Amino acid sequence: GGVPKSKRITTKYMTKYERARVLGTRALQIAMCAPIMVELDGETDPLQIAMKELKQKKIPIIIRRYLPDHSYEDWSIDELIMVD
Amino acid sequence: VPQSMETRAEVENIHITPRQIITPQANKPVMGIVQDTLTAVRKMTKRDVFITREQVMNLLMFLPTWDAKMPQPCILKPRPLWTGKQIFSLIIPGNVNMIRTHSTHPDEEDEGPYKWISPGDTKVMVEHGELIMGILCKKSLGTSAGS
Amino acid sequence: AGVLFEDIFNVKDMDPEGKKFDRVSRLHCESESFKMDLILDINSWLYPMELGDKFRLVLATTLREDGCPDSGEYNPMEHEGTRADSFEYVMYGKIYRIEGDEAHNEASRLSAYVSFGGLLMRLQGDANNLHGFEVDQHMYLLMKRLA
Amino acid sequence: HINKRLPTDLSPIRVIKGVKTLLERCVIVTGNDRISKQANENATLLFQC
Amino acid sequence: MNAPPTFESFLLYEGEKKIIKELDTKVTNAAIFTINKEDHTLGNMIRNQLLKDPNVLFAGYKVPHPLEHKFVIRIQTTADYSPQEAFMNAITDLLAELSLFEERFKDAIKEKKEGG
Numbered sequence: 001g002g003v004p005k006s007k008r009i010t011t012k013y014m015t016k017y018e019r020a021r022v023l024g025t026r027a028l029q030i031a032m033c034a035p036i037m038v039e040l041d042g043e044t045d046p047l048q049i050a051m052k053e054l055k056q057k058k059i060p061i062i063i064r065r066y067l068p069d070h071s072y073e074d075w076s077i078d079e080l081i082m083v084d
Numbered sequence: 085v086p087q088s089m090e091t092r093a094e095v096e097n098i099h100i101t102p103r104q105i106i107t108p109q110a111n112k113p114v115m116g117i118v119q120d121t122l123t124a125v126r127k128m129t130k131r132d133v134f135i136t137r138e139q140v141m142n143l144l145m146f147l148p149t150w151d152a153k154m155p156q157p158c159i160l161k162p163r164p165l166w167t168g169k170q171i172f173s174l175i176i177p178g179n180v181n182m183i184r185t186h187s188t189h190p191d192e193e194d195e196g197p198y199k200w201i202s203p204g205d206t207k208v209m210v211e212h213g214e215l216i217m218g219i220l221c222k223k224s225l226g227t228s229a230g231s
Numbered sequence: 232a233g234v235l236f237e238d239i240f241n242v243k244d245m246d247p248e249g250k251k252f253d254r255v256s257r258l259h260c261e262s263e264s265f266k267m268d269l270i271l272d273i274n275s276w277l278y279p280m281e282l283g284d285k286f287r288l289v290l291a292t293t294l295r296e297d298g299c300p301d302s303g304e305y306n307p308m309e310h311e312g313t314r315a316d317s318f319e320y321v322m323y324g325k326i327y328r329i330e331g332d333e334a335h336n337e338a339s340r341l342s343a344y345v346s347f348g349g350l351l352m353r354l355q356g357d358a359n360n361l362h363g364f365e366v367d368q369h370m371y372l373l374m375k376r377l378a
Numbered sequence: 379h380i381n382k383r384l385p386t387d388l389s390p391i392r393v394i395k396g397v398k399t400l401l402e403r404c405v406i407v408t409g410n411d412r413i414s415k416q417a418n419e420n421a422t423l424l425f426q427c
Numbered sequence: 428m429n430a431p432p433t434f435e436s437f438l439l440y441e442g443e444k445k446i447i448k449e450l451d452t453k454v455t456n457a458a459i460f461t462i463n464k465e466d467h468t469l470g471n472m473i474r475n476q477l478l479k480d481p482n483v484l485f486a487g488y489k490v491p492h493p494l495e496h497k498f499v500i501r502i503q504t505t506a507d508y509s510p511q512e513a514f515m516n517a518i519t520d521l522l523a524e525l526s527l528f529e530e531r532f533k534d535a536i537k538e539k540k541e542g543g
Contacts, residue, residue, distance in 0.1 A: 024090025
């Protein structure tokens with residue numbers, strides 16, 4: 001059930017339940033020595049690297065939001081807008 | 085202790101204390117200033133509390149968010165003296181504006197001519213993130229809504 | 232230069248409802264040149280007063296005699312050689328509200344409320360004698376007892 | 379630093395346009411359908427008031 | 428079972444510098460001096476000798492924790508006088524003052540014992 005991009009009716013604002021898991025998964029990926037997309041300013045805790053590369057929205061994670069009718073919408077990181 | 089660091093990220097982004105300040109049960113804070121800390125907040129905002137340069141100097145280093153810009157004293161001559169509201173003003177950050185009343189506020193004061201100048205220092209006014217008027221209590225620095 | 236208000240005052244009332252603070256005296260005063268009415272909060276122990284006394288009062292925007300504004304920060308150097316040397320009571324604060332005509336009343340009656348950290352000033356009278364007063368403006372009070 | 383004793387430069391037509399743009403941009407139930415619009419002004423009725 | 432040793436309140440560990448100087452960046456000519464393994468005594472002496480100096484504008488000690496024997500002093504002066512030189516003059520004046528205290532106490536004990 002691939003929902004088209006113009007057909008997506010979910011919200012365009014990424015909530016904190018997505019934020020925690022994307023931050024943890026990306027920091028874990030960096031913890032297995034993934035390439036870091038942005039410049040490093042001496043940070044050694046990869047969770048901090050996960051935030052400071054989430055600021056420029058350069059994280060390759062596709063969020064598969066599940067609708068109640070067993071259909072799924074794929075949302076990218078840069079399509080969603082940071083809010084806190 | 086979390087044994088996976090993505091769960092540690094979940095603790096940081098969800099389970100941390102400052103992200104859980106306001107309850108969804110009754111839209112109120114759950115932590116508050118209590119016991120002798122609240123008692124000395126009540127006793128420190130009083131109008132007769134005139135505090136010297138040395139004592140506010142002692143109180144200065146316990147504000148790590150301070151911008152190292154000390155205020156001009158309320159009393160300049162003959163002795164430089166501060167007050168309790170002037171040093172609680174440094175604690176309050178940002179733009180904070182607030183109207184409440186003390187628990188010992190008379191009801192006849194609000195319709196009188198002294199509703200904006202209280203002899204008893206009861207109505208509590210905060211303007212622009214600095215403490216201006218009133219003595220704080222459980223109503224202003226507690227778990228109640230609108231604090 | 233910068234003297235927004237300048238008058239001699241006489242005290243007519245001392246604690247009309249009772250003394251609620253140990254170190255704060257509340258005074259009711261009237262002038263002689265411009266018919267003003269004033270409610271004063273001062274330090275009681277530092278500078279004691281009694282009923283019927285006379286005091287010279289200057290309300291200015293800065294302590295600099297050339298009219299230039301101050302730096303806004305306290306230093307223990309620049310308090311002598313200025314306009315504060317001719318007065319024994321030098322306060323520094325900010326006006327928080329101005330009452331009177333507002334929007335829908337005549338401008339023959341005006342009032343200004345000044346907060347010195349908890350000490351309260353109510354200066355009320357004619358609006359043309361209260362020129363230069365605005366909301367959230369820093370203010371200097373100079374006061375000297377007279378025989 | 380708004381002065382409450384000085385004249386302002388805010389026209390009421392700009393105020394009404396800002397309120398209308400606010401109420402158009404503050405949506406909860408999305409969609410151009412009649413049911414979606416009815417739920418949109420049913421969810422935000424007290425906020426609009 | 429988790430009781431700390433009682434000699435750690437006055438003894439530095441291996442490779443532990445007593446005085447750590449940190450340059451403050453909020454204002455100019457300001458520094459923070461961190462001194463370990465001591466208490467409010469030396470900080471109070473340094474502070475109340477510094478407060479007599481008109482050349483200083485900021486001199487203050489703080490103990491962050493009663494369980495951690497460590498205290499910090501923030502000193503800011505004018506732009507003609509170092510905070511480190513201010514602290515040096517403070518401890519020099521303290522040493523001179525309590526040397527005068529030692530000799531006046533010795534003279535007092537001598538005259539009280541000889542006077543009977």
